[PDB]
Amino acid sequence: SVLFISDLHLEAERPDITRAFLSFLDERARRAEALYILGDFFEAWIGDDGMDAFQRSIAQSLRQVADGGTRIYLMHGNRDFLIGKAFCREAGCTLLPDPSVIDLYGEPVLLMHGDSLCTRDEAYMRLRRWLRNPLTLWVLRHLPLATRHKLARKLRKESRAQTRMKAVDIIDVTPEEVPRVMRGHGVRTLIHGHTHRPAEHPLDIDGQPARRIVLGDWDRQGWALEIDANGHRQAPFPL
Protein backbone atom coordinates (compact mmCIF):
# COMPACT_ATOMS: atom_id res chain seq x y z
CA SER A 1 0.00 0.00 0.00
CA VAL A 2 0.87 3.72 -0.35
CA LEU A 3 0.12 6.48 2.17
CA PHE A 4 -0.66 10.16 1.57
CA ILE A 5 -0.48 12.92 4.21
CA SER A 6 -0.23 16.71 4.14
CA ASP A 7 -0.80 19.84 6.21
CA LEU A 8 0.81 18.59 9.42
CA HIS A 9 2.44 21.97 10.15
CA LEU A 10 5.02 20.22 12.36
CA GLU A 11 6.65 22.48 14.96
CA ALA A 12 8.13 22.17 18.44
CA GLU A 13 5.13 24.01 19.95
CA ARG A 14 2.74 21.21 18.78
CA PRO A 15 4.12 18.04 20.41
CA ASP A 16 0.65 16.52 20.13
CA ILE A 17 1.03 16.55 16.34
CA THR A 18 4.63 15.35 16.48
CA ARG A 19 3.73 12.39 18.72
CA ALA A 20 0.87 11.39 16.42
CA PHE A 21 3.12 11.69 13.38
CA LEU A 22 5.84 9.49 14.89
CA SER A 23 3.23 6.91 15.95
CA PHE A 24 1.97 7.04 12.37
CA LEU A 25 5.47 6.35 11.06
CA ASP A 26 5.85 3.42 13.49
CA GLU A 27 2.47 1.80 12.94
CA ARG A 28 1.81 2.53 9.29
CA ALA A 29 4.51 4.18 7.19
CA ARG A 30 7.17 1.58 8.03
CA ARG A 31 5.04 -1.18 6.52
CA ALA A 32 3.91 0.81 3.48
CA GLU A 33 5.63 0.69 0.09
CA ALA A 34 5.68 4.47 -0.11
CA LEU A 35 4.70 7.62 1.74
CA TYR A 36 3.79 10.83 -0.09
CA ILE A 37 3.85 14.14 1.79
CA LEU A 38 1.87 16.70 -0.24
CA GLY A 39 3.01 20.00 1.25
CA ASP A 40 2.88 21.91 4.54
CA PHE A 41 4.77 19.15 6.33
CA PHE A 42 6.40 21.82 8.51
CA GLU A 43 4.79 24.94 9.98
CA ALA A 44 7.37 26.99 8.07
CA TRP A 45 10.67 26.53 6.19
CA ILE A 46 13.19 29.35 5.79
CA GLY A 47 15.64 27.31 3.68
CA ASP A 48 17.73 24.17 4.21
CA ASP A 49 20.59 26.18 5.72
CA GLY A 50 18.20 27.44 8.41
CA MET A 51 17.03 23.97 9.55
CA ASP A 52 16.63 23.90 13.32
CA ALA A 53 17.11 21.04 15.79
CA PHE A 54 13.43 20.06 15.74
CA GLN A 55 13.35 19.90 11.97
CA ARG A 56 16.59 17.88 11.92
CA SER A 57 15.08 15.37 14.36
CA ILE A 58 12.02 15.02 12.13
CA ALA A 59 14.35 14.40 9.18
CA GLN A 60 16.15 11.68 11.16
CA SER A 61 12.83 9.97 11.94
CA LEU A 62 11.89 10.03 8.23
CA ARG A 63 15.30 8.72 7.29
CA GLN A 64 14.92 5.70 9.59
CA VAL A 65 11.72 4.78 7.72
CA ALA A 66 13.31 5.37 4.31
CA ASP A 67 16.33 3.28 5.23
CA GLY A 68 13.98 0.47 6.25
CA GLY A 69 12.66 0.18 2.70
CA THR A 70 9.74 2.61 2.40
CA ARG A 71 10.05 5.14 -0.42
CA ILE A 72 9.29 8.68 0.76
CA TYR A 73 8.26 11.56 -1.51
CA LEU A 74 7.87 15.17 -0.45
CA MET A 75 6.11 17.95 -2.33
CA HIS A 76 6.21 21.68 -1.55
CA GLY A 77 3.35 23.52 0.06
CA ASN A 78 2.77 27.20 0.81
CA ARG A 79 4.56 26.90 4.20
CA ASP A 80 7.57 24.88 3.08
CA PHE A 81 8.21 25.61 -0.62
CA LEU A 82 11.82 26.47 0.25
CA ILE A 83 12.65 22.80 1.05
CA GLY A 84 15.63 21.79 -1.05
CA LYS A 85 17.61 18.76 -2.07
CA ALA A 86 19.91 18.86 0.97
CA PHE A 87 16.96 18.43 3.32
CA CYS A 88 15.56 15.68 1.15
CA ARG A 89 18.87 13.81 1.24
CA GLU A 90 19.00 14.19 5.02
CA ALA A 91 15.45 12.90 5.39
CA GLY A 92 15.78 10.11 2.85
CA CYS A 93 13.16 11.47 0.57
CA THR A 94 12.69 12.47 -2.99
CA LEU A 95 11.47 15.94 -3.89
CA LEU A 96 8.45 15.83 -6.22
CA PRO A 97 7.39 18.89 -8.22
CA ASP A 98 3.90 20.29 -7.94
CA PRO A 99 2.20 18.98 -10.06
CA SER A 100 3.29 15.34 -10.37
CA VAL A 101 1.52 12.41 -12.01
CA ILE A 102 2.39 9.00 -10.59
CA ASP A 103 1.51 5.43 -11.53
CA LEU A 104 -0.60 4.12 -8.68
CA TYR A 105 -1.36 0.42 -9.29
CA GLY A 106 -1.80 0.97 -13.02
CA GLU A 107 -3.80 4.23 -12.80
CA PRO A 108 -2.28 7.68 -13.48
CA VAL A 109 -2.87 9.86 -10.44
CA LEU A 110 -2.31 13.63 -10.14
CA LEU A 111 -0.68 14.98 -6.95
CA MET A 112 -0.69 18.68 -5.99
CA HIS A 113 -0.47 20.63 -2.76
CA GLY A 114 -3.73 22.25 -3.83
CA ASP A 115 -3.12 25.95 -3.31
CA SER A 116 -2.50 26.46 -7.02
CA LEU A 117 -6.17 25.55 -7.64
CA CYS A 118 -7.43 28.35 -5.37
CA THR A 119 -7.61 30.84 -8.18
CA ARG A 120 -10.45 32.98 -6.79
CA ASP A 121 -8.14 34.10 -3.93
CA GLU A 122 -6.56 36.89 -5.91
CA ALA A 123 -4.42 38.30 -3.09
CA TYR A 124 -3.00 34.85 -2.42
CA MET A 125 -2.42 34.27 -6.14
CA ARG A 126 -0.40 37.49 -6.31
CA LEU A 127 1.61 36.43 -3.27
CA ARG A 128 2.24 32.93 -4.65
CA ARG A 129 3.41 34.20 -8.03
CA TRP A 130 5.87 36.50 -6.26
CA LEU A 131 7.15 33.93 -3.77
CA ARG A 132 7.87 31.42 -6.53
CA ASN A 133 9.55 33.97 -8.80
CA PRO A 134 13.18 32.83 -9.24
CA LEU A 135 14.38 36.26 -8.19
CA THR A 136 12.42 36.07 -4.95
CA LEU A 137 13.64 32.58 -4.23
CA TRP A 138 17.24 33.62 -4.72
CA VAL A 139 16.88 36.68 -2.48
CA LEU A 140 15.04 34.83 0.30
CA ARG A 141 17.67 32.07 0.41
CA HIS A 142 20.43 34.70 0.80
CA LEU A 143 19.08 36.79 3.66
CA PRO A 144 20.39 36.53 7.22
CA LEU A 145 18.64 33.78 9.20
CA ALA A 146 17.38 36.36 11.71
CA THR A 147 15.88 38.37 8.86
CA ARG A 148 14.25 35.28 7.31
CA HIS A 149 12.54 34.44 10.58
CA LYS A 150 11.29 38.03 10.84
CA LEU A 151 9.88 37.93 7.29
CA ALA A 152 8.28 34.54 7.97
CA ARG A 153 6.58 35.86 11.11
CA LYS A 154 5.31 38.89 9.19
CA LEU A 155 3.91 36.71 6.44
CA ARG A 156 2.20 34.41 8.96
CA LYS A 157 0.75 37.33 10.87
CA GLU A 158 -0.64 39.05 7.78
CA SER A 159 -1.91 35.76 6.36
CA ARG A 160 -3.82 34.87 9.52
CA ALA A 161 -5.37 38.35 9.53
CA GLN A 162 -6.42 38.31 5.87
CA THR A 163 -7.63 34.69 5.89
CA ARG A 164 -10.03 35.41 8.76
CA MET A 165 -11.78 37.84 6.37
CA LYS A 166 -12.10 35.50 3.39
CA ALA A 167 -15.18 33.39 2.73
CA VAL A 168 -14.81 29.65 2.16
CA ASP A 169 -15.45 30.03 -1.55
CA ILE A 170 -12.60 32.49 -1.87
CA ILE A 171 -10.06 30.19 -0.29
CA ASP A 172 -11.24 26.71 -1.44
CA VAL A 173 -10.35 25.22 -4.82
CA THR A 174 -12.05 26.85 -7.80
CA PRO A 175 -14.56 24.22 -8.97
CA GLU A 176 -13.91 24.57 -12.72
CA GLU A 177 -10.12 24.38 -12.25
CA VAL A 178 -10.46 20.76 -11.09
CA PRO A 179 -11.67 19.24 -14.38
CA ARG A 180 -9.37 21.60 -16.26
CA VAL A 181 -6.19 20.31 -14.56
CA MET A 182 -7.35 16.70 -14.34
CA ARG A 183 -8.19 16.55 -18.04
CA GLY A 184 -4.91 18.31 -18.82
CA HIS A 185 -2.95 15.58 -17.08
CA GLY A 186 -5.09 12.69 -18.37
CA VAL A 187 -6.22 11.54 -14.95
CA ARG A 188 -9.43 10.58 -13.20
CA THR A 189 -7.96 10.82 -9.67
CA LEU A 190 -6.46 13.93 -8.07
CA ILE A 191 -5.06 14.02 -4.51
CA HIS A 192 -4.26 17.32 -2.80
CA GLY A 193 -4.26 19.03 0.59
CA HIS A 194 -4.04 22.74 1.49
CA THR A 195 -7.75 23.39 2.04
CA HIS A 196 -8.18 21.62 5.42
CA ARG A 197 -11.47 20.11 4.18
CA PRO A 198 -10.85 16.35 4.06
CA ALA A 199 -13.31 14.79 1.67
CA GLU A 200 -13.76 12.83 -1.54
CA HIS A 201 -15.44 14.75 -4.37
CA PRO A 202 -16.87 12.88 -7.36
CA LEU A 203 -17.06 14.71 -10.63
CA ASP A 204 -17.63 14.05 -14.31
CA ILE A 205 -14.87 14.77 -16.85
CA ASP A 206 -15.96 14.41 -20.47
CA GLY A 207 -18.60 11.89 -19.43
CA GLN A 208 -16.40 9.66 -17.28
CA PRO A 209 -16.40 9.48 -13.48
CA ALA A 210 -13.50 11.07 -11.65
CA ARG A 211 -12.60 11.84 -8.04
CA ARG A 212 -10.76 14.55 -6.11
CA ILE A 213 -9.49 13.37 -2.71
CA VAL A 214 -8.63 16.11 -0.21
CA LEU A 215 -6.24 15.23 2.59
CA GLY A 216 -6.96 16.43 6.11
CA ASP A 217 -4.84 18.77 8.16
CA TRP A 218 -3.56 17.66 11.57
CA ASP A 219 -4.60 20.62 13.75
CA ARG A 220 -7.23 18.67 15.71
CA GLN A 221 -6.70 15.05 14.62
CA GLY A 222 -4.32 13.20 12.36
CA TRP A 223 -5.32 12.09 8.89
CA ALA A 224 -4.01 9.58 6.38
CA LEU A 225 -5.12 8.32 2.97
CA GLU A 226 -4.08 4.73 2.20
CA ILE A 227 -4.35 3.33 -1.32
CA ASP A 228 -3.63 -0.25 -2.38
CA ALA A 229 -4.29 -2.23 -5.54
CA ASN A 230 -7.84 -2.98 -4.40
CA GLY A 231 -9.15 0.26 -2.91
CA HIS A 232 -8.55 3.22 -0.68
CA ARG A 233 -9.38 4.72 2.69
CA GLN A 234 -8.88 8.11 4.26
CA ALA A 235 -9.63 8.23 7.97
CA PRO A 236 -8.60 10.29 10.99
CA PHE A 237 -6.95 9.26 14.22
CA PRO A 238 -6.45 11.05 17.53
CA LEU A 239 -3.55 13.37 18.33
Ligand SMILES: CCCCCCCCCCC[C@@H](O)CC(=O)N[C@H]1[C@@H](OP(=O)(O)O)O[C@H](CO)[C@@H](O)[C@@H]1OC(=O)C[C@H](O)CCCCCCCCCCC
Ligand atom coordinates in the same frame (compact mmCIF):
# COMPACT_ATOMS: atom_id res chain seq x y z
C1 LIG B 1 12.00 33.55 4.32
C2 LIG B 1 10.63 34.15 4.11
C3 LIG B 1 9.68 33.16 3.46
C4 LIG B 1 9.39 32.03 4.41
C5 LIG B 1 8.28 31.14 3.91
C6 LIG B 1 7.79 30.34 5.10
C7 LIG B 1 6.34 30.68 5.37
C8 LIG B 1 5.86 30.81 6.79
C9 LIG B 1 4.34 30.87 6.73
C10 LIG B 1 3.88 32.07 5.91
C11 LIG B 1 3.55 31.64 4.49
C12 LIG B 1 2.10 31.25 4.37
O1 LIG B 1 1.48 30.95 5.61
C13 LIG B 1 1.31 32.40 3.77
C14 LIG B 1 0.22 31.73 2.99
O2 LIG B 1 0.49 31.01 2.07
N1 LIG B 1 -1.01 32.00 3.40
C15 LIG B 1 -2.18 31.45 2.76
C16 LIG B 1 -2.64 30.16 3.42
O3 LIG B 1 -2.89 30.41 4.79
P1 LIG B 1 -1.90 29.84 5.96
O4 LIG B 1 -1.86 30.96 6.98
O5 LIG B 1 -0.57 29.53 5.27
O6 LIG B 1 -2.60 28.62 6.47
O7 LIG B 1 -3.79 29.70 2.71
C17 LIG B 1 -4.88 30.61 2.69
C18 LIG B 1 -6.03 29.91 1.98
O8 LIG B 1 -5.52 29.44 0.72
C19 LIG B 1 -4.45 31.89 1.99
O9 LIG B 1 -5.54 32.81 1.98
C20 LIG B 1 -3.29 32.46 2.76
O10 LIG B 1 -2.80 33.56 2.02
C21 LIG B 1 -3.04 34.88 2.49
O11 LIG B 1 -3.80 35.09 3.42
C22 LIG B 1 -2.25 35.91 1.71
C23 LIG B 1 -2.83 37.31 1.90
O12 LIG B 1 -4.08 37.36 1.21
C24 LIG B 1 -1.84 38.35 1.33
C25 LIG B 1 -0.64 38.54 2.27
C26 LIG B 1 0.40 39.57 1.80
C27 LIG B 1 1.58 39.56 2.77
C28 LIG B 1 2.59 40.66 2.56
C29 LIG B 1 3.80 40.62 3.44
C30 LIG B 1 4.90 39.70 2.91
C31 LIG B 1 6.29 40.01 3.49
C32 LIG B 1 7.38 39.28 2.71
C33 LIG B 1 7.42 37.78 3.00
C34 LIG B 1 8.66 37.15 2.40
